[PDB]
């Protein structure tokens, strides 16, 4: 029996409209001893608000059991530590796992929007690029919009560790060339704890 | 100098129908549906469009006498005026030609373009238009001359038809040179785009040099106040524009403090109008309820409530409609003046531009004793909440918070 503790999603901690969760996942739970007890500690203080889910048999004939603890935005951002203790008969001893926000001096993202290469104007669709760099920790979210609507035809790279210990990523929004060439405005929207209000944006448009 | 409809209230520039009314709904028929809202602002005229056929930089595919069908039919326009007239809202048509281009006045075709205007003026005046706007006049050769021609054509049809000229010029002398030929012409400019004595100076110097003739007051020919002003000065500047002698001109969203730079994906000159929380794309953190019309309607402390109250005062009180204007000295960063017509209710405006709380330090002796100050005047409103509105304040003891403006009223006596 093995345990994996997962942090909340960046969007959940940064946007205060959403509900961040820490997730304790137990795998390799036997059919003989399927009962799992979860204990949760926030900075060593036990809490009782966690919601344990019904165990679910995997194709490898083992059970996966999940406990979900709702967290407070500010607790996560202020570096509180979440401990999941898993007890099971097949275990010599309970398994204890601890997770928190990465430690280290937060660093503000720099956001640079980059127009398509001229060489891409050959094509029917062009690539609008958003470079986000210089941020720590790696938790970040990126969204695109135009004047009136969300723009959903985008993909964002995972954060990559840069030379200086900060992180960067790129987001690529694909749009019809005509929309670009007609001077329509797009914006790359970034959420990170080290921004004012956890939010900034940069526009991108033809000259 | 007789009263005209544009003396009686604020003008309201709607330069982009779709931004104003919402996505897909940038039609003349959809503007009809917003006239009640506008009536709620007590605006006296909409400046509309342009709405004419313009293919970027195509002097030949530019017919100012034909509506671009994306906005709707000529019927919808006829039906809009009808509904607008019926609600006592006047309609000014922007005829700036190359509005899709970068030089609104095209290039190397100075006389060719002008002709389409001249013809458009007539055509649209016959259609029932209450006036016209033309922007970016500094990019029009023979500026002074072309405006005089269009003035005389507009005034020729009726003295109750207005022509607005807009410029990016903030230089006084250049503005006077355009106004030298046509003095009954409303000129929107960047003249007022700081110091309390300097805004005082600008205003007094302008009125000084124009013999206290009728003028517009604005921050620009098209842009929102938020282009020039930090949030903390918006309320003050609205109090001033609504109480200075002349026509205050705003752009849609000024009444809610709409700031294009704070909203992702928004062109400076045409952000989406925030009716409610469903108006803007779902970008979390971008629009709170208190940034929308719906939200600010519910709040007596809101900029929209303030706008509504000032527009009401400005459009019903003789001293504000056509009163004299007497500025006087105050604390360093204070601009203070009175408006007074005949024996109607007087208004005292005290504006604290600086970011430090100040004693008003009003001196009543530099004012003419035709309307010198009583000991106490009823506070009509403050830009900031928590004062005692409808009760007297002792004028010699006035302390204004940072960025605070006060509107006091007192009768003839
Ligand atoms: C029997 O089967 C189980 C189940 O496995 C699946 O089914 C079997 C039959 C096969 O098909 C498998 O391929 C299937 O996965 C086996 O269980 C697996 O054990 C692995 C260890 O041996 C374990 O690996 C560790 O994974 C970690 C990451 O897990 C992520 O990502 C994987 C995909 O990469 C995904 O499968 C996991 O479910 C998990 O996904 C995350 O889940 C969390 C919690 O739900 C999500 O976070 C929450 O999300 C919700 C919204 O959904 C909400 O937002 C909450 O706020 C938020 O917290 C999160 O979003 C998910 N991420 C993604 C990407 O989707 C690694 O970190 C870890 O690495 C470490 O250890 C490695 C060595 O093991 C090292 O190499 C490494 O360096 C690290 O140190 C592990 O790789 C698998 O996760 C686990 N699979 C599942 C499904 O739980 C079992 O092993 C097998 N028994 C046998 C045959 O032995």
Numbering used by the authors:
A (entry chain B): 238 to 444
B (entry chain A): 214 to 406, 410 to 629
Question: Mind quoting what the paper says about this structure?
Answer:
Here, we report the engineering and characterization of a BBB transport vehicle targeting the CD98 heavy chain (CD98hc or SLC3A2) of heterodimeric amino acid transporters (TVCD98hc). Here we report a brain delivery platform using a CD98hc binding transport vehicle (TVCD98hc), developed by engineering the β-sheet surface of the CH3 domain. One such BBB transport target is the CD98 heavy chain (CD98hc, also called 4F2, Slc3a2).
To gain insight into the molecular basis for the TV-CD98hc interaction, TV6.6 was co-crystalized with the extracellular domain of human CD98hc. The complex structure was refined to 2.25 Å resolution, with electron density of interacting residue sidechains well resolved. All engineered TV residues participate in binding to a structured loop region on CD98hc that lies adjacent to the α/β barrel structure, except for TVAla442, which was mutated to prevent the incorporation of a glycosylation motif. Surface complementarity at the complex interface is high, with a total buried surface area of 1551 Å2, consistent with the 230 nM affinity of TV6.6 for human CD98hc. Structural determinants at the complex interface also agree with the engineered TV binding data. In particular, the TV makes van der Waals contacts with Glu229, Gln231, His236, Ala477-Pro483 Ala486, Val488, and Pro497-Pro500 of CD98hc, rationalizing the engineering of an extensive hydrophobic surface on the TV that includes the Glu380Leu, Gly385Phe, Gln386Val, Pro387Leu, Val422Ile, Met428Tyr and Gln438Phe mutations. In the complex structure, the backbone of the β-sheet region on TV6.6 is minimally perturbed compared to wild-type Fc, with a Cα RMSD of 0.415 Å. This is consistent with the limited functional sequence space within the TV6 family, as only a subset of amino acids satisfies the strict secondary structure requirements while preserving binding to CD98hc. Whereas a rigid backbone Fc structure is maintained, flexibility within the Pro480-Pro483 and Ser495-Ser504 loop regions on CD98hc likely contributes to high-affinity binding. This is reflected in a 3-4 Å shift for the latter, compared to canonical CD98hc structures. All CD98hc residues interacting with the TV segment on TV6.6 are conserved between the human and cynomolgus CD98hc homologues; however, non-conserved residues proximal to the TV interface are expected to slightly alter the cynomolgus CD98hc structure.
